[PDB]
Ligand binder design. Structure first.
Ligand SMILES: C[C@@H](O)[C@H](NC(=O)c1ccc(C#CC#Cc2ccccc2)cc1)C(=O)NO
Ligand SMILES: [Zn+2]
Length: 272
C-alpha cells in the first residue's frame, strides 16, 4: 500500500499506566520518508529498536536524555493502520494508557489518514528464525501478509489460550486491554511501575476471579492483547512488517530480541 500520514494534528491525553502521571500527545503530519518518530523537549526519538532503553512491563524509548515510556500500544495501532510518517509529540513521560487498549487511538487515527505518493517498503521477513529465552519462544517465517499468533499458559482459571491475528482482522485486537494478575501487582509497584494502573485501564485477574465488574471483553482478551503488544514491538523494525510470527509466552524483552536479530540480518537491504 501507499505510505500514509495523518491529515490533521490529532491530540490524546490522560494518565500513564506506569508513571501514574498525566501526559499529552500531539500527532503531527510528516512527509514521505520521515518514518515514525516521537518528539519530546526538542529531541526526536525514532520509533526504532536502537532507541529501546527498557523492556520490563513496557517498551520504552530514549535519546539524548529524553525518555518516553510505554510506546507499544500507539505503535501497534500505527503499524496496523500502516501509518508510516508521523511525529508523536509527547508532553510528559509516558504515552497515555486510556482504556487499556488501542481503541481510542485506532478510531481517531483511522478517520484521519492521508495517503501519500510512494509505496511502503515493508520489512519482509526473508527466512525462518527462532529466538528463545527461559522457556519462552518466538518464531518468524516469510509471509506476504502480517500474521501473528500468541499462545499463553496462564497460572489461573484461563489456562492455555492462543489467538491468531491476520490482516483484515485489526478490529479483533485493538479493543483488547492490558492485564495483570493480582499476585504480581505488589512486586510491579515495588519496582517503580504500575502507578497509574486501575480497574479503569487494566484487566485485573486473580486465580479464580476477575476484579473488573464489567468482566472480560473477550474470553481470550489477554492473548489478544499480547498479540497487539507484539505488533507494536515489531514496528521497531522501522517499517510495517510482512511475516508470520508465533510467540509462546513472549514479552517485550523477547520481542525486542527478535526485532534486533531480524534487523541485523537485513541492515544492508534496509539502510539502502
Ligand atoms: C499485559 C503485559 O504485556 C503488559 N502490562 C503490564 O505489564 C502491566 C503491569 C501492571 C499493571 C497494573 C495494575 C494495577 C492495578 C490496580 C488495580 C486496582 C487496584 C489497585 C491496583 C498493568 C499492566 C503490557 O500491556 N505491555 O504492553
Ligand atoms: Zn500492552
Amino acid at each position: 500500500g501507499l505510505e500514509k500520514t495523518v491529515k490533521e494534528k490529532l491530540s490524546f491525553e490522560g494518565v500513564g499506566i506506569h508513571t501514574g502521571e498525566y501526559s499529552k500527545l500531539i500527532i503531527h503530519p510528516e512527509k514521505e520518508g520521515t518514518g515514525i518518530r516521537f518528539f519530546k523537549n526538542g529531541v526526536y526519538i525514532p520509533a526504532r529498536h536502537e532507541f529501546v532503553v527498557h523492556t520490563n512491563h513496557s517498551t520504552d524509548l530514549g535519546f539524548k536524555g529524553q525518555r518516553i515510556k510505554t510506546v507499544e500500544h500507539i505503535l501497534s495501532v500505527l503499524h496496523l493502520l500502516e501509518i508510516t510518517n508521523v511525529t508523536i509529540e509527547v508532553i510528559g513521560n509516558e504515552i497515555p494508557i486510556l482504556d487499556g487498549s488501542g481503541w481510542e487511538f485506532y478510531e481517531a487515527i483511522r478517520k484521519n489518514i492521508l495517503n501519500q505518493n510512494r509505496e511502503i517498503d515493508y520489512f519482509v521477513v526473508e527466512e525462518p528464525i527462532i529466538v528463545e529465552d527461559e522457556g519462552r519462544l518466538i518464531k518468524a517465517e516469510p509471509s506476504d501478509t502480517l500474521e501473528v499468533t500468541y499462545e499463553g499458559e496462564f497460572k489461573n482459571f484461563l489456562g492455555r489460550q492462543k489467538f491468531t491475528f491476520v490482516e483484515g482482522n485489526e478490529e479483533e485486537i485493538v479493543l483488547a486491554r492490558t492485564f495483570a494478575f493480582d499476585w504480581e501487582i505488589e512486586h510491579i509497584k515495588k519496582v517503580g511501575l504500575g502507578k497509574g494502573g486501575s480497574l479503569k485501564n487494566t484487566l485485573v485477574l486473580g486465580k479464580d476471579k476477575v476484579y473488573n465488574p464489567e468482566g472480560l471483553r473477550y474470553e481470550n482478551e489477554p492473548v489478544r492483547h499480547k498479540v497487539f503488544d507484539l505488533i507494536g514491538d515489531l514496528y521497531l523494525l522501522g517499517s510495517p512488517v510482512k511475516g508470520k510470527f508465533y510467540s509462546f509466552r513472549g514479552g517485550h524483552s523477547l520481542n525486542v530480541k527478535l526485532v534486533k536479530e531480524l534487523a541485523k540480518k537485513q541492515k544492508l537491504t534496509r539502510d539502502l
